[PDB]
């Protein structure tokens, strides 16, 4: 039963900056990555797997956000530099489950953690 | 019963970058077919036509890897893959004839020396192309190169022209001016020189574009639509019958001289391929003298070890996740690993690295599927004075059926029907085992041999140690009687020296390493798995330390030097070659095979100097 609390978020004028945090309490592997996915309130859920063998960004957010994992252990950070209010949205971790994707809603065995965040101008 | 055994060789797998480092691509302005070439001094060179047309790829097969491989594109596609195309060497050079789809005749002159040596690119108008003498109207589809500097070039209504750029009037060239073509019907028709008529043409004898023709001195072989037909300035004899059950088609066809069989005096050998999409088949007539006391069928192996030992769990030797994707990274060359990777990061099958089973089962198929769809046959090609070589469609991708020792025939043709029986009833028995156990007795024996089992004990109380922790969980004890009763029935002395002190125990390369290495696995493979037959029937009923004293101190040795090899083998096969290859070798780097009893001799020489290393 392991879990996967998260922190960092807030409300924040556009343009600033936040760091989001997640980290898991449980062993289960060094190996099920951690989806920094987002949820605007009424839109579905949109968008570092194997210890930074690969990255993969969104459109949205690419050269603004940056992704940061910690070598042999299950935390990931998101820097979120230039905030706007198309980034309003709720955030969550996740945690695969055998074979997996990074561009779909089946990527996870755990999520949880939601978080609320605004951004205003 | 299948004589002969198959060798997948990957030119590039003892490497860990593919594809080889100098690549050289000249413009002009998968796969479908591979071949190889012959040169004036002794090298192989290979060509591919992949994808259709615009593709014309040249590699060396001795030094694959640090040889540069030559890339040449085409401007026009063709109207025909691989048949529209004559390479051949004059003057120390090759010559590449081909016709684009824009009517244009492309001769390439590709020099010796430029294949091999280091150069990058290297200037000068090699490649001269002929707008005139052809015409959208007549397209033709084949062309064969004529020995004398000519070109004889077919259409579909039967018809031909000769290329001295143009001079008018299946195909091969008998003799030296006698061309013997062959049609859509089928029938066959003569040439001469006397370039205007024809000696004979075949009628469709109905009751009684490809390679269906084979030449060889005055004896020509033909494929009816299957019927082998015979014919020996004659043209008559007898056709032979086929082995069919689903529809097959034929790959490429090669009549030789005799190798060296099983069989009675003979007189001629006939190579066939067929191939079901990716799947192939490789069979040989065996014919006694004047084509009629015999017509003997001998199959092969149509898959390698590696594959069986991956496909029927029947591997023991090979050792979490992470180790056993370094099993697979090894056990296929980097080119299939790598399309593999490739092919699964299209699909977006991002891996779940530790504790994931779903990730590796994914990798295991596509890893087999890459490697058939790579081994999928184009051509034959003759090796040495006798070996025979498999082109594969992807580059770099080759097969060897290698002749079969007595071992290996008795390996591979269980079923059929004294110390074969004797090796029979171990097989019997120890196919009831779970691979477990036999892992847990090889660890035994192991131990016995280090140490690590106590070396006061008595061989009687190794042995019934072993049964109380590994042999004393349940086996079919009605197997145990089969077994033992089976037994009772030979004399095992006898059959054990004969097994033991006759039958077990006695210029870059590069592709000698790649043929040797796998020879070599195979046999010592076959030679423990029958080691820990033999050592399971001494540990299952207790036998005096008096009567195979010599006998099972031998045994050990031998079990422990196959299972050193076979575990040396899983990793680092380029040191374990550089090594194997420099201990047995003059210049160290190994022996040019010429013919099957050299091969063998060369692979028995290893397993020699395997069996008498110092413990």
Not at chain 2, 187 to 204: A, E, N, P
Request: aromatic residues 12%; contains cysteine.
């Amino acid at each position: 039963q392991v879990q996967l609390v998260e922190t960092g978020g807030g409300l924040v004028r556009a343009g600033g900056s936040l760091r989001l945090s997640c980290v898991d309490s449980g062993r289960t592997f060094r190996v099920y990555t951690m989806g920094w996915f987002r949820q605007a309130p009424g839109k579905e859920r949109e968008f570092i797997r194997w210890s930074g063998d690969r990255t993969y960004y969104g459109d949205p957010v690419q050269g603004r956000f940056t992704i940061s994992r910690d070598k042999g252990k299950n935390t990931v950070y998101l820097q979120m530099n230039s905030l706007k209010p198309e980034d309003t949205a709720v955030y969550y971790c996740a945690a695969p489950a055998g074979g997996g994707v990074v561009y779909d809603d089946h990527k996870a065995y755990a999520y949880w953690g939601q978080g609320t965040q605004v951004t205003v101008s | 019963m299948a004589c002969l055994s198959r060798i997948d060789a990957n030119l590039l797998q003892y490497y860990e970058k593919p594809e080889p480092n100098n690549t050289v691509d000249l413009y002009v302005s998968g796969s479908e077919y591979s071949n190889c070439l012959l040169l004036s001094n002794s090298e192989y060179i290979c060509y591919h036509f992949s994808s259709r047309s615009t593709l014309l790829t040249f590699y060396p097969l001795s030094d694959a890897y640090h040889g540069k491989t030559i890339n040449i594109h085409l401007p026009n596609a063709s109207m025909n893959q691989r048949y529209t195309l004559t390479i051949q060497e004059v003057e120390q050079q090759l010559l590449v004839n081909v016709i684009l789809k824009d009517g244009s005749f492309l001769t390439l002159q590709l020099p010796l020396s430029f294949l091999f040596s280091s150069a990058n690119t290297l200037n000068g108008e090699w490649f001269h192309l002929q707008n005139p003498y052809d015409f959208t109207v007549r397209v033709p589809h084949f062309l064969f190169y004529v020995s004398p500097q000519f070109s004889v070039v077919f259409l579909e209504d039967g018809g031909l022209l000769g290329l001295k750029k143009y001079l008018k009037s299946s195909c091969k060239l008998f003799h030296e001016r006698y061309l013997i073509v062959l049609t859509q019907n089928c029938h066959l028709k003569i040439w001469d020189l006397t370039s205007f008529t024809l000696i004979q043409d075949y009628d469709m004898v109905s009751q009684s574009v490809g390679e269906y023709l084979s030449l060889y001195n005055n004896t020509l072989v033909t494929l009816l639509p299957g019927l082998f037909q015979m014919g020996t300035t004659f043209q008559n004899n007898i056709p032979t019958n086929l082995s069919a059950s689903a529809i097959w088609s034929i790959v490429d066809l090669v009549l030789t001289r005799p190798l060296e069989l099983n069989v009675e005096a003979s007189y001629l050998n006939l190579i066939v391929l067929w191939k079901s999409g990716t799947a192939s088949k490789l069979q040989i007539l065996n014919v006694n003298d004047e084509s009629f006391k015999n017509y003997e069928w001998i199959e092969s192996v149509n898959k390698s070890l590696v594959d069986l030992q991956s496909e029927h769990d029947l591997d023991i030797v090979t050792k979490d996740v992470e180790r056993g994707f370094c099993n697979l990274k090894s056990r296929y060359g980097t080119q299939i690993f790598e399309r593999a990777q490739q092919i699964l990061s299209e699909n977006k099958i991002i891996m779940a690295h530790n504790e994931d089973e779903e990730y590796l089962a994914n990798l295991e198929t596509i890893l087999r599927d890459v490697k058939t769809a790579f081994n999928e046959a184009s051509s034959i090609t003759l090796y040495g004075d006798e070996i025979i070589l498999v082109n594969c469609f992807q580059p770099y991708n080759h097969s060897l059926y290698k002749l079969n020792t007595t071992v290996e025939n008795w390996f591979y043709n269980m079923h059929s029907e004294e110390l074969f029986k004797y090796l029979r009833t171990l097989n019997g028995f120890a196919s009831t085992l779970s691979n477990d156990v036999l892992r847990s007795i090889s660890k035994k024996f192991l131990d016995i041999i280090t140490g690590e089992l106590p070396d006061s004990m008595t061989t009687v109380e190794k042995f019934t140690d072993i049964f109380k922790n590994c042999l004393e969980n349940q086996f079919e004890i009605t197997n145990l009687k089969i077994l033992f009763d089976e037994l009772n029935s030979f004399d095992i002395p006898v059959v054990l020296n004969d097994l033991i002190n006759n039958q077990m125990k006695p210029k870059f390369d590069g592709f000698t390493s790649i043929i040797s290495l796998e020879s070599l696995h195979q046999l010592l493979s076959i030679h423990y798995r029958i080691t820990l037959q033999v050592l399971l029937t001494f540990v299952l009923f207790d036998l005096d330390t008096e009567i195979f004293g010599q006998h099972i101190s031998t045994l050990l040795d031998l079990h422990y030097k196959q299972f050193l090899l076979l575990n040396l083998y899983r990793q680092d096969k380029c040191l374990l070659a550089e090594v194997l290859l420099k201990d047995s070798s003059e210049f160290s780097f190994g022996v040019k095979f010429f013919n099957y009893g050299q091969l063998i001799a060369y692979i028995d020489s290893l397993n020699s100097n395997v069996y008498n290393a110092s413990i």
